[model samples]
Target: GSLIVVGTGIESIGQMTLQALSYIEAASKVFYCVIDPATEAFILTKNKNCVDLYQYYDNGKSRMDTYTQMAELMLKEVRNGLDVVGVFYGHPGVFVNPSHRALAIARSEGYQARMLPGVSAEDCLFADLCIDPSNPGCLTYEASDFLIRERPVNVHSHLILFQVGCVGIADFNFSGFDNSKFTILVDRLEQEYGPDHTVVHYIAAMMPHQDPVTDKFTIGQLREPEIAKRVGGVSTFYIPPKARKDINTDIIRLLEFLPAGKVPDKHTQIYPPNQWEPDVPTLPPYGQNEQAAITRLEAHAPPEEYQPLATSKAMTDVMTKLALDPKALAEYKADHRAFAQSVPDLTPQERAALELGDSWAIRCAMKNMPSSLLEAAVIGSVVSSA
Candidate 1:
């Protein structure tokens, strides 16, 4: 008799590893305990000699008792000289106890036993929840263990309490676990964090293409049945520090002696400031050719950059005369500096470009040449006489 335990990760088949599939296919007996029907169906597609170990669970059943029964069944199958594989959801070695118990018992009884790793709910939490453990030193605990032991939480660190819905009672129920005593857990936390401290009752989706829940609420709200009802067997509590930790001046002093780059001097400015900022990621152009890119670029002129009724439109009159009147063009080209200097109405850039004989620069500068022939003559006579 031999035993190999496998994990299906948090989802169904998409996360099951290649090595796990190989063992499951060759196993004489396949046992699995999964919360979702899709994962159950997936195991069925593998070895035909399959058994649902979850059959041992019942509403309000002592979870430890059910776990023992699950282990016993696997041991029974292993004793029958069948190559057995026990598949579980998430990391088989995480949260769940039956796999480890079964493996220990199997190994103790002189059977080959081993377990393979897979993605755990915390792995999904890190991604879905947008948290980095190393950023603030994330710490984890089981709700009941945390409560029973009365573990002191580091308020400055990120805290995660698993099985929050079940709390002190490790019992199983489909309807819902009795969470009345959950207040005991929160009351302790409130003592340290206070009633208004924010907390997240998060649940990673059990299936692919399902919505993962992130319930942001205060510690006091855990007593509310409406919110607490949603916090169930799969629920986990993620609590971030309510206040910035007091800096340890001793460490700062020690780091002060280190190299300049070693101790970052940043943090002088507040990012995403306290008023709150949107985190919506800016999207790149999803579809575009060079012409479309150029089109958008051209369209980006803001009102601040726009000048309505631009005076430069007068350039058409000046340019037309220069192009058509040969004598006027000859006089301008022969002594453009003096000619531009005589036109006092032009801007500095306009005169410079006109004297330099640069048609390109000249076009942009006085493209506001006296537009109307009547107005051109009117300005020509009325220098500033009004």
Candidate 2:
């Protein structure tokens, strides 16, 4: 008996790798925990034996307990001498408690178990948001743990707070979320970076034709009802460094003593004051095809040279739905909470963006759609507004 855990990636339809698909198709028993209906349907086509593990989640159940139960279930099938394939959304090893636990239990019980990598939301965020983690470095943590544990904040590095909407929530529930914890989180952030510091609320799109939702605002604005209402289960907070730290003169001096080839480049600025800023380019107005041209150019560019927006087809579907219904669009803009609950098949980020009336966020979410389809959708929105 053997067990193989694989990730379907954030957008399982297009993001799933061939190796992961092969394992799912060939497994004797397959268990999947994807939240997207499109992904669920796709998985079933590959393996008729596919079983949904999401049924394990119950109201008022601790997520930890649910994870344990999922692991136990997968292990039980492994012990039955069947080749079990467990499919999880996003990267299998990244923040996947059940995948890790199942692998551990399977190995300890004398079974072969292994996991394969897949694209994570973090990977999408880097591409969609144009962030280079290596440049200034980055720090990441669960929002609740960062607050409850009083983790130190490295203000010099970019900070990533995961599960921002789920902060202070430890149990499983399908309905309403408490955002009171966000107020407390903002207060804690204000203590470190001051009230005026900029922060971004980000949600990586789960489909290839949808753009990621990125909303930039000050730390002080987080408490506003309008902002608070937009937070959702998949929301993440990104905090940029207030200022660049000065280079240590001692380190630079020491570097001068090294071999000439090893010495720091002359073009490297040793002090922030000595850094030269490049001229900003002027761009045409939005939707004039300039942005699309730039996007196409960036797609073929090297990773370090440019960062492209991540998009998904699910986002397009949601936007198209909204565009088709004028009353719904008005309702969405008027009362986000009520509108969000009324919508079906929306990922957390999509729901949040719709409620927030984030046009750019929605546009970015549509970056992956075909130009013709995207334009049609945009025109529909205009007609709906008219």
Candidate 3:
């Protein structure tokens, strides 16, 4: 028995590599956890025995528990003497616990197991955001883990924050997600970068011909009611480096003296030699005591009644239907009130938001919807008013 894991790429179609496709078509059993409906259907065509791993997800269960179940199920299939292939969205190895866990179990059991690389959300993000990680380098973090761990951050490197919308959430419930958790994140960032630092909210498109969504706002603005509504499942937070530090003269001189082939690159000189040396306090530092400041900041509690809008299933269905069809989105833009009337079961507030083309309210109604649908609503709101 053998196991192979492959990625479906970010897009629902046209992004799957030839090798990935071949593995899917040749495998005796295929298991997949792709978010897009179209990609799930496409994989089924290639392998008649394709199983949906998404069925393992339960609203009340911990994500880790769901992931474990998925991995165990795949391994069970592998032990049954079948050539099993597990397909995941984006890169199978990137932010995918089940794929890696299953592969590890398969290999440990003396079964042949291998993984193939595929385009990731980061790949799409780099292209859409026009960022080159090689320039100054980049760092990434999962939103909840970063907040709880207090990970050391470098202001000099490009920072990417994933799952920003689901901060503080540890379970699998989608509709119950809270956005107020952003206050904690914003407060922490303000300490390092100041209130004026610009932060970007980004979402890469999941389909060809769709434009990626990008929103720019200052650190302080993230706390605002209107802007807070924009954060959703696919939202990624990006912070460009504050500013480049001055070059180290000592390192530069050393580099100049070296032979041509042995010359060190500028990026290699991250810290001066003195910085690496053990520190002894020469004099009392001039800055305020950081520990005391943190203690004072922690004394205050977050607002107890800071409830934002709840995600509506009806709103999600309507927005998704409109977003998938360009003609519908265009018609909705031209006559929003008429379009609003066509969709049934929308709340009074939801109907008014759609009819009046109020972006903030529309965004509130469209909570828990996919990033693409939120982007479509934002674009449609702009075009309708224009």
Candidate 4:
């Protein structure tokens, strides 16, 4: 008998890795627990013997009891010498105590057991937040353990607190968390971190069209009623350190023991060479082609005397300048804005593109952006500001 645990990742079909798919298909019986219906259907197509594991949850019942029951259910099939496969959402190993427990029990009984890694919610969180765990280091804690054990949170590292929306909640319900324990959590956090520390509430997108929510707020302001309403099961909390620690001196000293001339001794800062005056060459004034292009753009502009009043009147101004009929502009603008607003919000990475400026931004936006914003820019209603 053998037991294999695999993850389906965050997306339904998009995240199903080939290896995971193969394992699921080969299994004699499949046990499943995924967050979305799309994923559940995808697994059922591959293996008809799938068993839904989410039925064990009940309100007011302790989660520990529910997990213990889940482990026993999976263990029963494995004990009967069946090639059992357990598929879960996100990473199978992450936040899945039952998967680990079952594996341990199966191995103890002299059964072949293994676990395969799948893209987890934490993985999606990193991409959505534009954060690299290796750069700042990451410390993750389940909400209960984080609060009960008074987990040592490294402020210098990136902090991820999961299941914050349902703290003190033992039963599984479609509804959201109760915030009674929220004030207690606030008190504990305030002791270690000042009231002014910055925190982020993150929720990864469950579907392709949806945008992940990463709301930023100060610790002190979090207790406000309006802010508390937005917290939920999908939400994860992040707190960053105030400052980066200086490089360790011992590491610098150890590098000195390397081969001669191999070590980087002193650092050098290169300076820009001064521009020397060159002999002046006479050139003709504005060329016809250059002047014509400028003239075409300016023709749409209101009189220089009108100045700041030259702002556009929707599509009419741009279409008239582009030679598009005036009748089509309003429909065009409406169609464009409708499409633009339908597009997903700026991802943290896509938002970074704005810092790089027009050409690169346009290229990235065109490839990753929704068609509406591009249409707006093409109509000349919007242009690169800098």
How many steric clashes between backbone atoms does each model show? 8, 11, 0, 0
**Per-residue lDDT of candidate 4, residues 217-298 (tens digit):** 8778778878877877667787765444454545656776555545332321112211111112222345575578878996
Q: After superposition, how far is residue 54 of candidate 4 from its true place, in Å?
A: 0.9
TM-score each candidate.
Answer: 0.65, 0.67, 0.65, 0.65
lDDT of each: 0.71, 0.72, 0.74, 0.66
Residue 199, candidate 3: Cα error in Å is 1.0
Model 1 alpha-carbon drift over 4 Å, by segment: 244-263, 266-386
Q: Which pairs of residues have clashing backbones in candidate 1?
A: 9-90, 311-368, 312-367, 312-368, 314-368, 314-369, 315-367, 315-369
Better of 2 and 3 by lDDT: 3
In model 1, the worst 10-residue window by lDDT is 377-386
TM-score of predicted structure 1: 0.65
TM-score for candidate 4:
0.65
At residue 47, give the lDDT of candidate 1: 81
Candidate 3 local Cα displacement, residue 56, angstroms: 1.6
Tens-digit lDDT track for model 3 on 40-67? 8889888889888877765766777777
Among all candidates shown, the one with the greatest lDDT: 3
lDDT of 3: 0.74
Q: Per-residue lDDT for 242-315 in model 2, tens only?
A: 76555565576777776553544433322222111122222325544666887888667477645355545666
RMSD of each: 27.6, 18.9, 23.0, 20.8
Off by over 4 Å in 2: 252-386
Residue 19 in model 2: lDDT: 76
